[PDB]
Symmetry: C3
Subunit: 241 residues, 3 copies
């Protein structure tokens, strides 16, 4: 079972039924019967007479399903057309459900919640990556590395066969021009040479920087790339600890 | 591997190539070669002169993948050309695709086949499974009042202020864009030191009012209650 | 936990912030601050200055998440006004991320890649499925099978109760007329008789072929379908 969307598509239908209500009172009956068809039993509601404006579902996304609770994020619009009065709302919307013999139903009244922000904060300053150290390495080694990297970065943006000469398992990139090496700290690791590198590429008319960790093996007068990452680790200059 | 859509996007492409055929006879050639590129080898079909009208794919969704079989739900329209006019007939069906993988790459291995779209809605329910909110509890009139007085504060806070809510309840987030309106129902049940309230109440969001259900687990604190646990369902077997 | 899209929706927001830059050189500042809010710390960039044209995100899809690396496929347009030049580009776009207490952040500069083709090739010709063999099986069995399969295929397109008489656990199909059996190779396997079959169905005004493997058990004067597959195996004429 690599994929199973049956539940999700079901609840998507529920959510549409619930947040959809047209203006014409005729057609407004059928809509509610469509909605009631989702429940095992229409929920027992003591309240006398709910008020209910016409509504359109603008956007729905299932964020999680945990136990017998599905949680959506919803954006819907409430309209009275006479001239038009409108409001747009977003909310969380939580649906209690269950399964009978591979079939689904809504089991209960849904409930509203706030959409939670996903972004983390409160970061230790110890977790920041500053690219400010300098290595105490030869200018001659720096020249050799620098000369290798222009070839590498040329190949990495242009030719797969050439890249395979100087690097293991590295795919080339599309639609890109190499421009500049802007940073390079070198660290000997027994027989390997780690290069931590930031460089500059142009895609269309726009340039971006990216970071690399190269693991270099000596071959001929030059290098071979045994391993390439796309992040510089925080502990990159730990030849100093 | 938290997420992997590679297969799904692939099959999405297959399904579009299969249910798409334009009118322009020049463009209609290339479309078939595009389709044939999905298979390892174009499937062997004995029947000659298949009848293939133009069609447009209106909608496709992968519903499951099991083994080397993908199952879609499809809505497409065929453009059937008469003499006097043209017909546009709209069909939905299920559509099952046999596939395989070579070294993290994909291909369609076989002729796909059509099926009925499964209804996902359950039915034929025992009446024993319904939630009937009718009873009056065996529980004191005075407790009824104290709970009722607590719940207006709770519900006020639950819709208005996080700090206040934390005084009277553990780990309960407030709700957005909501006004409290009414408590409409309340059955109380003694559980040793705790008091379970089953509660239905009425909120206004925008210009619309909805009912919702709660199970509170209430602990005595001061002259009042503390909310140890809050659920958003009343359980079927809630009474005595 | 059947479903959890929290990460995916997060990275969708990142990708929109990154590939979006409006023309107004002032509302262009707030956009960058919106983008910077994703990272734990705004990445340290040694290169000075940098050229950034307005851009609109046309399309994004997360293809994989592996470790702390998300990989997208992206389609965006760059808008250069001087009249208007628009470049439309697709690329891969890889985002390094992490989680603190069920929350997310982008941890580093993202990087571009080629969108990998998903289609396999380089197939052995031994793996092609040709329906071209003829069985060395009696002409009388051929007739009995043929007569069964018209009933089966009629039922399979028309009536569930009838289908259950002649087959275990086979759902009928909707909106379909049976038309023709176009191929049939028969093979005894111990007690069962395997039929490999291709037939022709009409849905709307269009006809398609499909393939079946039936496992047939003798019942009465006829067959019972113990197992139905929808693919003929490569090694069928064994």
């Amino acid at each position: 079972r690599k994929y199973d969307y049956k539940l999700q598509y079901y609840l998507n239908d529920y959510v549409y039924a619930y947040f959809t209500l047209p203006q014409e009172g005729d057609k407004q009956q059928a809509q509610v019967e469509h909605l009631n068809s989702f429940y095992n039993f229409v929920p027992d509601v003591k309240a006398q007479g709910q008020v209910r404006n016409p509504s359109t579902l603008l956007d729905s996304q299932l964020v999680t399903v945990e136990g017998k609770v599905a949680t959506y994020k919803v954006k819907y619009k409430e309209m009275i057309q006479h001239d038009t009065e409108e409001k747009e709302l977003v909310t969380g919307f939580n649906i209690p459900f269950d399964e009978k013999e591979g079939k689904y139903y809504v089991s209960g009244l849904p409930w509203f919640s706030c959409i939670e922000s996903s972004q983390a904060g409160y970061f230790s300053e110890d977790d920041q990556l500053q690219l400010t150290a300098n290595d105490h390495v030869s200018d001659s080694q720096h020249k050799k590395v620098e000369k290798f990297l222009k070839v590498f970065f040329t190949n990495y943006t242009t030719n797969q066969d050439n890249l395979n000469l100087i690097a293991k398992n590295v795919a080339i990139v599309c639609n890109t021009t190499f421009k500049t090496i802007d940073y390079t700290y070198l660290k000997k690791d027994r027989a390997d040479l780690i290069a931590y590198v930031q460089a500059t590429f142009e895609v269309g008319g726009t340039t971006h920087s990216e970071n690399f960790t190269f693991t270099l093996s000596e071959k001929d007068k030059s290098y071979y790339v045994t391993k390439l990452e796309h992040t510089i680790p925080l502990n990159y200059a730990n030849d100093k600890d």
